[PDB]
Each structure stands twice: as C-alpha cells, then as structure tokens.
C-alpha cells in the first residue's frame, strides 16, 4: 500500500469520527476534508449477539483492527471528532467512547487532538414516546 513520499519527521493526520451510543458503535477514519475515506468497522461485525454491539470490548476490538490499516497506508496521527446521537434524544456518549481510545492509542497510533461534536438543536421537533413516555 502506497503512502506519501515523506512522513519521516512529520505525521499525516486523519479524522477518526468515533460514534457513541447504544446498540451500535462505528469507527470511520477519513481524510482531513472528510470527502473521501478508508475502512469502516462496527461492533456488530466484531461481535454478533445483537446486544454486545455497544459493549466496551466490541468497540476496542473494532479500533484494534482499524488502527492497523491506518498505519499500513501511512496515516499515523488522528484528530478526533465525537458524535453522540442528539437531535432531541439522549445527547450523551455511550460506553464505547472511552473504550476505543484506550485501545487504539496503545496499539501505536498517535493522538493529535480531541473535541466534542454533537448535533444539539436550539429547540426543534417533538420527541417520540408521547406525553406519558415509556414505562416498563
């Protein structure tokens, strides 16, 4: 796999786009622009049980593979963008947010920056569940 012709003293910086919350974890490594991208792995692909897709180790096992293919190509460092679901929903990270970072960093990849990005309305449309909401 052909990387760029220098990366010896510099690094090449990708964006990691970690997805958060329940019943799902994505890790989707992209360009700086985000226009084009590389491999994309889910916790539903590592673990099949339909109930461990949000688990810590399923998120770790995902990033443990994705981080190999990064360095295989020539992407060595990562800026990080987070995404919790939002849009008048839970708007809080899942379990597999803390998890994937700890695994991918110690696999050998560099971390450049980290930030929160979540789609938060300035007040928008009514939430599913009705007036009385879920119970049981």
């Amino acid at each position: 796999s052909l990387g760029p012709q220098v990366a010896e003293g510099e690094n090449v910086f990708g964006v990691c786009h970690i997805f958060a919350s329940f019943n799902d974890t994505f890790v989707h490594v992209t360009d700086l622009s985000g226009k084009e991208t590389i491999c994309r792995v889910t916790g539903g692909m590592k673990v099949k049980a339909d109930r461990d897709e949000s688990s810590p180790y399923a998120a770790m096992l995902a990033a443990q593979d994705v981080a190999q293919r990064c360095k295989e190509l020539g992407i060595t460092a990562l800026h990080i963008k987070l995404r919790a679901t939002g849009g008048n929903r839970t708007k809080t990270p899942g379990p597999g947010a803390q998890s994937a970072l700890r695994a991918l960093a110690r696999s050998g990849m560099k971390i450049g920056r980290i930030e929160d990005v979540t789609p938060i309305p300035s007040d928008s449309t009514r939430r599913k569940g009705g007036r009385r909401g879920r119970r049981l």
Binding site: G3, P4, Q5, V12, F13, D31, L32, S33
Partner: peptide, 19 residues
C-alpha cells in the same frame, strides 16, 4: 496523494494532505 497550501498570511502554510 496531494498537498494543501494555505495563504501567505499564515506562518505555517502546510495544512496537510488529501487524495
């Protein structure tokens, strides 16, 4: 591979790389 260059007003003009 490619390179991405910034204006002269920035001290470091080497933004990064795309493809």
């Amino acid at each position: 591979w490619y390179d991405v260059k910034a204006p002269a007003m920035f001290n470091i003009r080497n933004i990064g790389k795309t493809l």
